[PDB]
Amino acid sequence: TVSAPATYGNFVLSPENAVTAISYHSILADS
Amino acid sequence: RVASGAGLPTSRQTTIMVTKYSEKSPITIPFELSAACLTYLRETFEGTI
């Protein structure tokens, strides 16, 4: 096993899912 | 009216209606904004200074 980064960075906002959320914006027409 | 005349009565009751005509005119200009910058308004960010 090897460690990997979890978040892509600190500056970016959650969700980590990213594109899966923005697609819903198109179809409708801790830190 | 000037009533000083003894023998002179005005023919009119001094209620002269007067019609005029309107003139409409368009007021239009091109306008623009950047939707790529508008998305920051759409997404209501708060996470970083």
Curated annotation (Swiss-Prot), chain A:
Coiled coil: none annotated. It is found in: Virion; Host nucleus. Self-assembles to form an icosahedral capsid with a T=16 symmetry, about 200 nm in diameter, and consisting of 150 hexons and 12 pentons (total of 162 capsomers). Hexons form the edges and faces of the capsid and are each composed of six MCP molecules. In contrast, one penton is found at each of the 12 vertices. Eleven of the pentons are MCP pentamers, while the last vertex is occupied by the portal complex. Homomultimer. Makes the hexons and eleven out of twelve pentons. Interacts with triplex proteins 1/TRX1 and 2/TRX2; adjacent capsomers are linked together in groups of three by triplexes, heterotrimeric complexes composed of one molecule of TRX1 and two molecules of TRX2. Interacts with scaffold protein; this interaction allows efficient MCP transport to the host nucleus. Interacts with capsid vertex component 2/CVC2. Interacts with the small capsomere-interacting protein/SCP. Belongs to the herpesviridae major capsid protein family. This is Major capsid protein. It comes from Human cytomegalovirus (strain AD169) (HHV-5). The lineage of its organism: Viruses, Duplodnaviria, Heunggongvirae, Peploviricota, Herviviricetes. The chain holds residues 295 to 343 of 1370 of the full protein.
